[PDB]
């Protein structure tokens, strides 16, 4: 009855549409009736090998909102882990003898799937592995889309900025591609284009996507405008001309936006969303960030508790 | 109702006298009678953009003594700060922050929404100073208070002087190098209120009269090295200086100390800087409890 | 109990009876958890020296008993390097906040120095970054006791860097407080077990011998205790091992234990690390109740 019990959460690709809807339904229930003791007597490792203050504080808050305890580190440079040449595999194996679940973010794509080979029984939750996947960002993104659009089907969704290195949009496009009738607009520098493996997937599913050279040319029809930061720390040095944001959203761009349209951003932002956007009714990134608590609580509850909420 | 509920606490002098009295009464109540589940189901951010280890550990201990959960960062190892605050304020019930840049905490209050911001670096230092005085002397009025060291640039003695001047009948003794004197605008306020103060070049000459001796550093940057070499010993406290001390007298120091309190002071009955530091727990518990809990602890 | 409010700086300060009390308590807590035992305690996790595995193990143990934690995970991140911040004053202040202090520090004796300034507050030494500190030897002993059923009359082989792997020095001294144990030391000449350890065993009438390989003694060993050079064990070397034999390693390991050992029934270094939780729970419960 709880298909996420004790499941590793590494990639959206591994989750089903029903899985996504179950997390979202559980998040709305907990948002409505908190369960502050549900994970009492659990200890969870917050292992941010790659620092990400917003995501870690979101995850750790969600742990505490369910009554779990927390141990961990905020950056692998603040640790002695690996300093003698030992493997990440061994680090995970040892930590897995301590805790009831491992939340990990790591600079290398695939590191979270590697961890699942060595964690024995303990679930690994991928809080972001380099430029690859970010499945819990997608879960809070979907909860937010569901909340503001009333549905996850038949949406016009624009994704802007660094689509190549953006783990956020890899996971979110895969998830939305599990629903029906969605239409994608990709607005990105040529060098930071959405990768081919995402495009082939949409093709094989018969899902329409197209490339666009401006936000304005798609503004009138988008329901969700998903903005991203250039992943400066992941760019190849030959991609240095792409560090500066090529597409900037300003309040004036919203003059012909649909009444229901919301602008999302996984955050942090550089200048791709000007601060005059913050005051409009379309700005929804901080609401989105707040919904991460409910999405991440839901996931933690479903993974760590045998039965449903 | 509780007048500090959901209030930002950025500066000590934003506190009315009634609110100061409320904090101090609440600290005393919690110290005598702990309330270990008061902040159960609260999550508090401990946001130390620049490390301030002793202050962070004190604040976080205070959170746990009240049953609250804690998330944060202990060190970073304007536009982003605004967004950082906006994001964290969607997670937590209160933000405790230390930040080295001018105006950072007040700017945080513009972007935290309904989430109160508590400045850790600062208001809780003057609060724990006052709490420690009130607890060791039984009152905050009609005291003899000596302050020693860099009285010109020390913000902590300025705040303590200003706060103690809101109580009646205190007599002040300022003991400082001539170049680091208590500034005129403080003196002017004491003058106009009829509060007696005097200057003294030695700790010993007022030791017989003082209830609180509040010690601070005289840093080498402040004086010429020829002057520093001749003057510093006048502002160093040694155990032998305490010969004529009243039995109630307490030696305070906001910490860290360098050499201005010799270690032989540490085991006299008058040394009280470590107990004062421990009182930060109760001062910080009080502020957290009043800001975060709608109802007063009865 | 005799450990109440006591500093735990060095395992050699513990008698045989003290070791038994910790191990018995560890076993009791493993059998029947006590999740609220240290409810309303706040414990300081002061890792001046990072030692992250030991830190995570210690903090998990605190949480499994219901205590709260404050601390820092490396000196470099703190303000304890600024002028006037001394270790003595830092401990003096922290001991007004917390109910106990767990501390690792890069300099030898740092934890013992801290007991001079912590007042009534117990200090628990977590080492200098290495695996020599009391709870490591306690979890080693707990793991030997649990798997072998005893701490007496064992055949213990210690392999690797026996000169600088000080945890083998502690473990040998601890096991020499028990009865009838026999030691096999397998190490290069430059990294051989220190003479002061051999003399100690001699004084106790405890048998030991040096061996050039582990195949020489494998059929008789009960515990194979491996160390990292501050002699590579492979799955095929275990063919003639006794059914009770267990391979231990304080960790981290590099190449001295090939990963094909991990799947064999004798690999026990990750179970051993897991036992850190119960040894550390036990120490904290006894020191604070
Ligand atoms: Ca525009
Ligand atoms: Cl993947």
CA-CA gap between termini of chain A: 11 Å
**Domain count of chain A:** 2
Q: What's the order of the H and E elements of chain A? A: HEHEHEHEHEHEHEHEEH
The CATH architecture category of the largest domain in chain A equals: 3-Layer(aba) Sandwich
Shape of chain A: globular
DSSP strand tally of chain A: 9
| Largest beta sheet: strand ordering of chain A | 7-6-5-8-9
Structural class of chain A, please? Answer: alpha/beta
CATH homologous superfamily annotation of the largest domain in chain A: Aspartate/ornithine carbamoyltransferase
| Rg over alpha carbons of chain A | 19 Å
- State the CATH topology of the largest domain in chain A: Rossmann fold
What oligomeric state best describes the polypeptide chains here? homotrimer
Major sheet size, sense and barrel closure of chain A: 5 strands, parallel
Instruction: Bin the strand percentage of chain A.
Output: 5-15%
CATH class of the largest domain in chain A: Alpha Beta
| Ligands, deduplicated | calcium ion, chloride ion
| Helix content estimate of chain A | 25-40%
Tally of helical segments of chain A: 9
Largest binding interface between chains: B-C, 26 and 26 residues
How would you explain this protein's 3D organization?
The structure is a homotrimer. Helices cover 34% and strands 14% of the residues of chain A. Chain A is α/β, with parallel strands linked by helices. Chain A has two domains: 1-127 and 292-305, Rossmann fold, CATH 3.40.50.1370; 132-291, Rossmann fold. Chain A has a five-stranded parallel sheet, with helices on one face. In chain A, strands 2-1-3-4 form a four-stranded parallel sheet, with helices on both faces. In chain A, helix 1 (17-32) crosses helix 5 (135-149) and helix 5 (135-149) packs across helix 6. The relative contact order of chain A is 0.17. Bound molecules: calcium ion (CA) and chloride ion. Calcium ion binds at residues 215-216, 250, 253 of chain A. It is classed as transferase.
């Amino acid at each position: 009855a709880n298909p996420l019990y004790q499941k590793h959460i590494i990639s959206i690709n591994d989750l089903s549409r029903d899985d996504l809807n179950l997390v979202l339904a559980t998040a709305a229930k907990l948002k409505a009736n908190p369960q502050p003791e549900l994970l009492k007597h659990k200890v969870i490792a917050s292992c941010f090998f790659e620092a990400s203050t917003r995501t870690r504080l979101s995850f750790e808050t969600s742990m505490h909102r369910l009554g779990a305890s927390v141990v961990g580190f905020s950056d692998s440079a603040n640790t002695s882990l690996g300093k003698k040449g030992e493997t990440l595999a061994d680090t995970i194996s040892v930590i897995s003898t301590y805790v009831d679940a491992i939340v990990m973010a790591h600079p290398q794509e695939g590191a979270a799937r590697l961890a699942t080979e060595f964690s024995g029984n303990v679930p690994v939750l991928n809080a972001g592995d380099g430029s690859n996947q970010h499945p819990t960002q997608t879960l809070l993104d979907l909860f937010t889309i569901q909340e503001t659009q009333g549905r996850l089907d038949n949406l016009h969704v624009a994704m802007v900025g660094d689509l190549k290195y953006g783990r956020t949009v890899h996971s979110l496009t895969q998830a939305l591609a599990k629903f029906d009738g969605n239409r994608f607009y990709f607005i990105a520098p040529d060098a930071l284009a959405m990768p081919q493996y995402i495009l082939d997937m949409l093709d094989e599913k018969g899902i329409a996507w197209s490339l666009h050279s401006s936000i304005e040319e798609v503004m009138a029809e988008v329901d969700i405008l998903y903005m991203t930061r250039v992943q400066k720390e992941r760019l190849d040095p030959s991609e240095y001309a792409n560090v500066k944001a090529q597409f900037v959203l300003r309040a004036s761009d919203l003059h012909n936006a649909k009444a229901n349209m919301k602008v999302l951003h996984p955050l942090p932002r550089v200048d791709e969303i000007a601060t005059d956007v913050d005051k409009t009714p379309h700005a929804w990134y901080f609401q989105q960030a707040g919904n991460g608590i409910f999405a991440r609580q839901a996931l933690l509850a479903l993974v760590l508790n045998r039965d449903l909420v």
